[PDB]
Design an enzyme around this catalytic site. Sequence first.
Site, PDB file in Angstrom:
ATOM      1  N   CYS A 298       0.990  -1.199   0.090  1.00 39.14           N
ATOM      2  CA  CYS A 298       0.009  -0.050  -0.104  1.00 39.14           C
ATOM      3  C   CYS A 298       0.782   1.309  -0.024  1.00 39.14           C
ATOM      4  O   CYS A 298       2.042   1.251   0.456  1.00 39.14           O
ATOM      5  CB  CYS A 298      -1.105   0.019   1.113  1.00 39.14           C
ATOM      6  SG  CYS A 298      -2.053  -1.388   1.213  1.00 39.14           S
ATOM      7  N   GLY A 299       0.528   2.378  -0.549  1.00 38.46           N
ATOM      8  CA  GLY A 299       0.974   3.578  -0.571  1.00 38.46           C
ATOM      9  C   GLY A 299       1.764   4.020  -1.830  1.00 38.46           C
ATOM     10  O   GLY A 299       1.221   3.909  -2.803  1.00 38.46           O
TER      11      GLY A 299
END
Lengths: 508, 516
Positions: B202-203
């Site tokens: 994620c990110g």
Amino acid sequence: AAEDALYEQQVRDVEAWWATPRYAGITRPYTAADVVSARGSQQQSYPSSTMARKLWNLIQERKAEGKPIHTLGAIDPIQMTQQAAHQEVLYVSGWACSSVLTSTNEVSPDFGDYPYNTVPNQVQRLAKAQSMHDRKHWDARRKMSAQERSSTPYTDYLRPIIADGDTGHGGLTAVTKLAKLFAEAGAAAVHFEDQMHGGKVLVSTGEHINRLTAARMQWDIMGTENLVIARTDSESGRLISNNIDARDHEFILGVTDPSAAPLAGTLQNMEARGASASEIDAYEAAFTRDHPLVTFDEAAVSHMKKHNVDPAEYEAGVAKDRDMSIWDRRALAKDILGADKPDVYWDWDVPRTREGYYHFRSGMRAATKRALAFAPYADLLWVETGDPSVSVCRQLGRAVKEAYPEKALVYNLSPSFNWMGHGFTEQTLKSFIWDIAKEGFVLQLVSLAGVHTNATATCELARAFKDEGMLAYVNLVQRKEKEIGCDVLTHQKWSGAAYMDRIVGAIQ
Amino acid sequence: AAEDALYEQQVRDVEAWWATPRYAGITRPYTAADVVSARGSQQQSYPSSTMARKLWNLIQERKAEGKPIHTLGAIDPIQMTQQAAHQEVLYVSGWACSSVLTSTNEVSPDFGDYPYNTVPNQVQRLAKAQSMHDRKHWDARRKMSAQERSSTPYTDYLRPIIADGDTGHGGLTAVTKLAKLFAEAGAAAVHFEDQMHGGKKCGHLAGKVLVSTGEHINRLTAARMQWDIMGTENLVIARTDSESGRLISNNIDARDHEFILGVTDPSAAPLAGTLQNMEARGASASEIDAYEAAFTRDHPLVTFDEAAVSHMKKHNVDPAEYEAGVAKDRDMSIWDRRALAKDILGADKPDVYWDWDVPRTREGYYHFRSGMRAATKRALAFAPYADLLWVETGDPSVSVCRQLGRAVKEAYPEKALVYNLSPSFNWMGHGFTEQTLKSFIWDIAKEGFVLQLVSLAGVHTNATATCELARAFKDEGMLAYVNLVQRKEKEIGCDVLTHQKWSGAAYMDRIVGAIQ
Ligand SMILES: [Mg+2]
Ligand SMILES: [Mg+2]
């Protein structure tokens, strides 16, 4: 002591609690000491109790306005999310659970014969989804500007849940355990119906009162304020399992023909000598034809006018005491008849079913009486009244209001009734919910709504997808979902993906 | 010995079982003795195996015709009953389970992170409902005349179930336990995908993480071993997402080495170790985020092949020998590619500089060149271990499907493929006409994509129908319910209209009447 102070403090607290307006008019046959003695030393708070207070306040507000809380039975978290902006409460049906989600995954027609953790598990599934979508929603708003928050409507995913408790699923200890599971699962309110556990067979008036009292005591022990809803099916229930309660005696039917021999005995004797199943059915049919059933009140007045005796004394006594036992009724009748006249013949045992059930005169007379009998033990009253009629509703509503002016009623809106074919116009079909809400029917529900919407949508798509493939999917689903603005269209965001993304990003 | 003689018979029975056409071309790295030794003394039969044989026979028939088995993801027994007359199989999605029914009732976005009995529990729920409706149907038909049965079409509620096994939910022992649960629950087939258990990154550089080719093969083999021990014929479906996965968790397998990316700048220091020192010096998350973003910009990634050819051209060396050598051996290890480049360059040239460790993510993931080249190579690698191959291909494209189907069929001409039909793709805004939108399923079925599914179909129909009713009911009450539900339900002949009969009320009434 440490324990003595805690005990005494809780006894004072419970007594004060029962004296608040929330419990005005509610009868409890046990004491505050009884309750605190059963609590142990560990206090716990339940979200279902906050939801119960939310529901109670909403009922008070809508009842004062003569307005409805009308909702649709929901069978899964998707339906919950799509109702949340529109319906103010959520309803969970045991019928739905029986055919779509059981604790053993064994689905069946509704006999209330799943394990009794079935409907509480469905409540928990919906309540945990409510909390997930509330968290997603709160996270979304914190990412908005402060003025965009003022511009955007808040969606309340925490709608109070009302759930089906069936008959309580056994004895009083079962009822307490079922009530416990519901308060733990998240239900704000639970309804319990006056049928026998295991067409319809009623239990005695007192048996059902004891169930309602058992649920209340368990919630009292837990310190929670969940709502007891009492349901009666005595409008259509023609059999009763138990003749012990005098409050039921005026509706139990018996024979007047002394030449009638107990039916159940004959039927077992017949089955012993090898008689055919049809032959037993045929005799039972003939027996009902030959020997008509009446109430003892009816037999007594017929006997008195037949023997030239004024029945007014009897009629006044039974009118003065609706709950007079059969024993005291026979006593009253013989005094009026005197020694010279013969005594009333009447036998409710002779016509009992094979199971031993008694025959019961169903109707709104019995149902209104049971509603009033249940009123001091229940926060809402649910009377099945038959086919929808503003007229029948108005009569029931006034009968209850004159005895208990603050009691709210529930109405079960039929999904299968032929409204237009039975006198309704488009205008009166539309106003029906609001017409009866003015008469005190504050909570209203289409029990199987989520079953029927789901079945119809899949039926339409399945047929078309076979021959038209993705053209049918786009036309019937994707295009429509976009047109009406259903937020599941962007399913990743709908499920909460952005919410989990931020949490993981914070951890790393 | 008597016992030893029996054992040898069971071994011979397993060997004969594996020699039937059902397992033509399937590779098993274990022996029949291995399997019988794990079996114990009682064998039992599983309905899922009968359904698996029914599914296998249907695939064989439809593949020969070039015809589709297209179905819709169903989330409950109601949808199952309405699909039974129309869709020949039933599909159970893990995405749907994650948001609608978990074994703990904790619903959430799909990270494959519910407990692993979740999707088997949903299979069991549907299979037990199939049995209930079959019994209802059979009972009703025995009440008809013999002629009325001949005239009335038979409804088959026993449609084979295909279910999502995610990544297998852990190591090899978890894969075997999950396979066992699915066979007990009633699934005819299960798919397993070559992603790392524990979900996507994620990110920054958010996206899927692949495992090595060999890791996913071991999962497929574990599932087959468990079903072999159970004596069941459930179908293994191998799914690859290497068309879009840009990270890989493990570089151990030479079959992945041609796709792994690295830096060519000798002045680049290891990124993850720099970010960890910065975090240890009090640097904020934003300052760390900044250094990472700048590192990605300043040091482009290329494959080792691209680095070596570019290096040869810089030093006036003909790269033809290198290019011909790695074209011939697509599976050449990085170790061997470096040696080949070094031998071509000779003692009087500097060696290629290339480092696949320097740009690794903070988790230690390697960068991977996703695309249909990788996806096709993995499909072929998984083929000996899978009854069906599921290759994610990106935007729906008959052209890409035709190329993949031909590439598979030139090495495995009997192998059937799965296609995942997107419910969210804007078909009509991305080059389809109404006519080619309709024909798409049949167009790719001719190229070998025999099993096809709209995985979230039952999520979307359910949401849409309740959205429409909920809005109208608030203001129109029972008028909305009649207009939007009751009237439509009757006009299309939906058999749930009479819900008592639909639920099986007459079936149970006869059982109770027979008991008394
Ligand atoms: Mg029920
Ligand atoms: Mg999955």
